């Protein structure tokens, strides 16, 4: 994405346009909603991206969790970004993931100060989400 190519309500950072959508949906419906916007749930490849995200969500206090584009990959037996790519940057909160077959969210609760957590209800736990496009 060019710095001025993000559509209305979206924010540019590091070649991507982001949407912090506050409609509450389970993880699957959040995945689907990012697809409807010709995007995908966000994938966080760097400390720089993580800090950009934290800067937005630590600015608000309504929500304690946001869905992102990471989930259990049975095939590989590990959490992967939803594009299939490996989780290289370590943005997990202390002692996470604590179980398999989850989906990932940023979580602001106890020891997890807006880091990644794994949740094992990927359908019925409703929260806001963060969409990402690289405009390709």
């Amino acid at each position: 994405c060019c710095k001025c190519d993000c559509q209305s309500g979206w924010e540019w950072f590091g070649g991507s346009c982001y949407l912090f959508d506050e409609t509450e949906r389970g993880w699957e419906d959040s995945k689907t909603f990012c697809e409807s916007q010709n995007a995908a749930l966000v994938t966080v490849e760097s400390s720089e991206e993580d800090d950009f995200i934290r800067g937005v969500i630590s600015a608000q206090s309504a929500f304690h969790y946001y869905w992102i584009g990471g989930s259990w990959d049975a095939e590989h037996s590990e959490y992967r970004w939803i594009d299939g790519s490996s989780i290289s940057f370590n943005g997990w909160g202390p002692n996470r993931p604590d179980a398999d077959e989850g989906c990932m969210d940023y979580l602001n609760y106890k020891e997890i100060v807006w880091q990644w957590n794994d949740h094992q209800d990927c359908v019925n736990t409703k929260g806001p989400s963060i969409c990402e496009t690289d405009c390709s």
């Binding site: 994405c1 060019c2 710095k3 001025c4 190519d5 590091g14 070649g15 760097s46 720089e48 405009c135």
Partner: protein, 137 residues
């Protein structure tokens, strides 16, 4: 993001930025200070449309074969990135570049590099024109 409105006299508007293609003769370090003196920065190229824009302007003249841009070797990160600390998004290296000389970036037109990025070892005493950018961010 600027509008055409915000471009001072003699600066070109593109993609929410104002650009100065300045034809002076300065080192990379001298070009950096020159852009600052115009409340600007050596240009940073975040996407392929901005790269195509720049190549369009640079291919309109043949007096000059390189223009300085706002990238150099970063000692903190041991990589090439923009002078604001932002890692590269769009990659614009010409065929066979970079030469990995821990130097300063220009747009170059020489043999197989056809208005694409090159790194020069001498950031002080190799004199050329430059591209400043105001992006209103």
């Amino acid at each position: 993001c600027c509008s055409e409105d915000d471009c001072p006299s003699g600066w070109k508007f593109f993609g929410g930025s104002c650009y100065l293609f300045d034809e002076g003769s300065r080192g990379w370090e001298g070009s950096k200070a020159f852009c600052e003196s115009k409340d600007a920065s050596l240009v940073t190229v975040e996407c392929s449309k901005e790269d195509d824009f720049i190549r369009g302007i640079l291919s309109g003249q043949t007096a000059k074969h390189y223009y300085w841009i706002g990238a150099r070797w970063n000692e903190e990160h041991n990589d090439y990135r923009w002078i604001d600390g932002s890692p590269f998004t769009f990659i614009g290296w010409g065929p066979g570049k970079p030469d990995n000389n821990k130097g300063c970036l220009d747009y170059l037109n020489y043999k197989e590099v056809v208005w694409q990025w090159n790194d020069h070892v001498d950031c002080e005493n190799t004199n050329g024109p430059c591209i400043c950018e105001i992006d209103c961010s």
